[PDB]
Design a binder for this molecule. Structure first.
Ligand SMILES: *[C@@H]1O[C@H](CO)[C@@H](O[C@@H]2O[C@H](CO)[C@@H](O)[C@H](O)[C@H]2NC(C)=O)[C@H](O)[C@H]1NC(C)=O
Lengths: 49, 221, 371, 49
């Protein structure tokens, strides 16, 4: 109910793709899910707007 | 007890004496808090006259607070007194006319500030009028004085909410330095319902002359 | 011949004498019969709000057709010549600064009557883009103080980049007077780009280098580009090696800068005199609330006044009014001392014979993308 | 003043305005000019912008 960063295990199509790239691609990967619930969209920043 | 030191100045072409209101305010002033008042008046406004006089009264007596009164609406005046405020750090305010008239963004050091209002807000007032009868405003132009850049943003901020269906057609600047024509030919391009003006009355005078030639004076503008 | 007064505020009485001398030379330079020139000036006693009093009392009362101004030898705060631009503003009297290269008065919406020959610190970015252009690093980082100065520099450089695909990666804003600044650099390490450019005051710059050295930012594979102010003053004593730097040409000499402005102004007024219905600047501070109609016209002709030959160098002004084609001398920190690796004039850089220095001592250090 | 002076603050005089450049004996310490921007008078809501 209270949400705070948490270490988790994630497995996916996009993950298999990412590692496929990682073998194909030299770059090494560390993944953390975004805190924001939505991917997000450009929006007015309250008072800043 | 505290016996504060205060000064007020009435400048005018309309008849009243500071004395009249002096004693009045001290009577009204009397019960709420201690106050010591020196009143002075000067007939017509000048950068030199005002600066000299205010320094002349302030230095002689260690006044802590003052106000300003005038029967004139000159635009530059506010800034001048504001400039004095940045250096002095003495609170100042004004109750009528030009001092009450709006001024450019206040400096980091606090200045005198009664005339100023959020131009943005002022525009939102105007927008309320626009909301009732105005949509797709003909033009907003940063022609002269303070906030040419500043006014420009807010229109965007107003438009940015995108709560309703807002839009702009004309968005340019300029006036006096070259042929009015570069701005004018651009202005000819816009075809909209309400002209938005952010220029001084002096500029405006010329703008009036521009609009008649322009055809802005005609219905739908 | 009507002596057309001129007025000025200058550092010292000797420079006043220099002014009067140049003015007297003036009759020979621009047809003598058409105009008469008289010189008036002040030695700028440091009264914050009274010198201006006298400017109005004396100079406005003297109806000077124009005023010259220079930065005071004694240094108090910065951008002291704020009041005059406002005060003459009612007068609509052209002002010409000799020493004000600062960008604070760039805001012509309130500094409308204001003018100068030297380019501001913001315009230095013209060099950096050209510098960036040569070396082919599209990826950089910008560190600016938070004020009209830094933000203006950012706007200018970004505007330069706008013609290209906009390049805004890693802009970094810090606020002046801050001693603790290391935390931000820890954030800076994460960014891919390895080239850095910064603008700040000398006092702040000490703190910047002090904090940067702690995190070992200066190391090879990193590049530093900077403003004239940064290389100067206390900034040097705790400072790093192999960092590019800039110095405006002719900054040191005020009298030299002044002779040139007057010759240039002379073209503006003499040419201006021929035009019909000109009005004298408002006579007497008192009794006036109205502008001077001509001033904008004087500005319009003066945009095209041409005096490329000059003591200071070529002279032309853009729509903004800031000088054009300014020349800077690139500086290097070799052996913890300032040296000219090259000199920059016009739109093209020039390479002096001196060997290039970089962080780590490599002769050439082009690659900025370690990733 | 009742909100500043009465509430542990000193309301300093202007002191120096027309001479030299001495920084006016520095800025007044704890001047507290802008502590209140939303006040009333006679019950009038004269809160300020
Ligand atoms: C700034 O200009 C002054 C005056 O023109 C220069 O002072 C001269 O220096 C030269 C040195 O070669 C002397 O021969 C002259 O007697 C000095 N006064 C003159 C020329 O009348 C000064 O050198 C210039 N500043 C710099 C850094 O060059």
């Amino acid at each position: 109910p209270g949400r705070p960063t948490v270490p988790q295990c994630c497995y996916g199509f996009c993950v298999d793709l990412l590692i496929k790239l990682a073998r194909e691609m030299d770059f090494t990967y560390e993944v953390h899910l975004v805190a924001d619930g939505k991917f997000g969209t450009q929006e007015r920043v309250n008072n800043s707007n | 007890f505290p016996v504060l030191n205060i000064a007020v100045i009435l400048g005018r072409t309309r008849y009243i004496t500071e004395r009249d209101i002096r004693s009045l305010w001290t009577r009204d002033m009397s019960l709420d808090f201690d106050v010591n008042v020196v009143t002075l008046l000067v007939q017509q406004t000048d950068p030199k006259s005002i600066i000299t006089h205010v320094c002349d009264l302030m230095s002689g007596t260690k006044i802590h607070g003052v106000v300003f009164g005038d029967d004139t609406d000159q635009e530059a005046i506010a800034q001048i007194l504001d400039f004095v405020s940045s250096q002095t750090f003495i609170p100042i305010l004004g109750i009528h006319g030009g001092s009450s008239m709006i001024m450019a963004d206040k400096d980091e050091m606090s200045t005198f500030f009664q005339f100023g209002a959020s131009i943005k807000q002022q525009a939102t007032v105007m927008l309320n009028i626009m909301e009732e009868y105005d949509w797709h405003v003909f033009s907003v132009i940063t022609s002269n004085f303070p906030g040419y850049r500043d006014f420009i943003s807010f229109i965007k901020t107003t438009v940015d909410n995108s709560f309703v269906g807002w839009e702009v057609q004309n968005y340019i600047t300029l006036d006096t330095s070259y042929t009015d024509a570069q701005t004018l030919t651009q202005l000819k391009k816009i075809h909209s319902s309400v002209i938005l003006l952010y220029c001084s009355k002096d500029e405006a005078t010329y703008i009036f002359e521009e609009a008649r030639s322009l055809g802005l004076m005609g219905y739908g503008f | 011949p009507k002596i057309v007064n001129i007025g000025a505020v200058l550092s010292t009485k000797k420079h006043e004498q220099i002014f009067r001398e140049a003015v007297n030379q003036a009759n020979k330079r621009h047809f003598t019969r058409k105009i008469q020139l008289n010189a008036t000036s002040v030695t700028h006693r440091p009264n914050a709000i009274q010198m201006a009093l006298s400017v109005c009392e004396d100079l406005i009362s003297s109806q000077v057709y124009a005023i010259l101004v220079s930065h005071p030898p004694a240094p108090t705060d910065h951008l002291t010549p704020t009041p005059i631009s406002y005060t003459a503003g009612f007068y609509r009297i052209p002002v010409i600064g000799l020493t004000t290269r600062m960008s604070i008065y760039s805001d012509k919406s309130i500094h409308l009557s204001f003018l100068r020959t030297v380019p501001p610190y913001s315009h230095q970015a013209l060099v950096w883009f050209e510098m960036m252009r040569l070396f082919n690093w599209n990826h950089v980082i910008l560190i600016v103080s938070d004020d009209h100065e830094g933000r203006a520099a950012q706007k200018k450089l970004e505007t330069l980049l706008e013609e290209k695909e906009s390049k805004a990666d890693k802009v970094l804003q810090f606020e002046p007077g801050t001693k603790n600044l290391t935390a931000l650099l820890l954030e800076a390490k994460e960014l891919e780009a390895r080239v850095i450019i910064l603008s700040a005051s000398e006092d702040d710059a000490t703190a910047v280098y002090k904090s940067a050295a702690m995190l070992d930012m200066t190391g090879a594979g990193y590049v530093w580009l900077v403003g004239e102010r940064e290389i100067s003053g206390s900034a040097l004593r705790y400072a790093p090696d192999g960092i590019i730097g800039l110095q405006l040409i002719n900054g040191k000499n005020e009298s030299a800068h002044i002779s040139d402005a007057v010759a240039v102004v002379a073209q503006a007024i003499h040419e201006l005199f021929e035009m019909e219905q000109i009005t004298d600047p408002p006579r007497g501070c008192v009794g006036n609330t109205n502008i001077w109609k001509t001033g904008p016209l004087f500005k319009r002709v003066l945009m095209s006044s041409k005096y490329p030959d000059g003591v200071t160098g070529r002279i032309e002004f853009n729509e903004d009014g800031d000088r054009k084609f300014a020349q800077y001398s690139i500086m290097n920190l070799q052996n913890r001392k300032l040296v000219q690796v090259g000199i920059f004039d016009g739109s093209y850089i020039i390479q002096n014979d001196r060997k290039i220095i970089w962080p780590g001592g490599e002769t050439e250090r082009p690659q900025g993308y370690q990733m | 003043a009742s909100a500043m002076l009465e509430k542990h603050s000193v309301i300093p005089e202007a002191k120096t305005s027309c001479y030299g450049q001495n920084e006016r004996n520095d800025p007044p310490l704890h001047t507290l000019h802008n502590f209140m921007i939303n006040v009333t008078w006679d019950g009038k809501d004269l809160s300020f912008t």
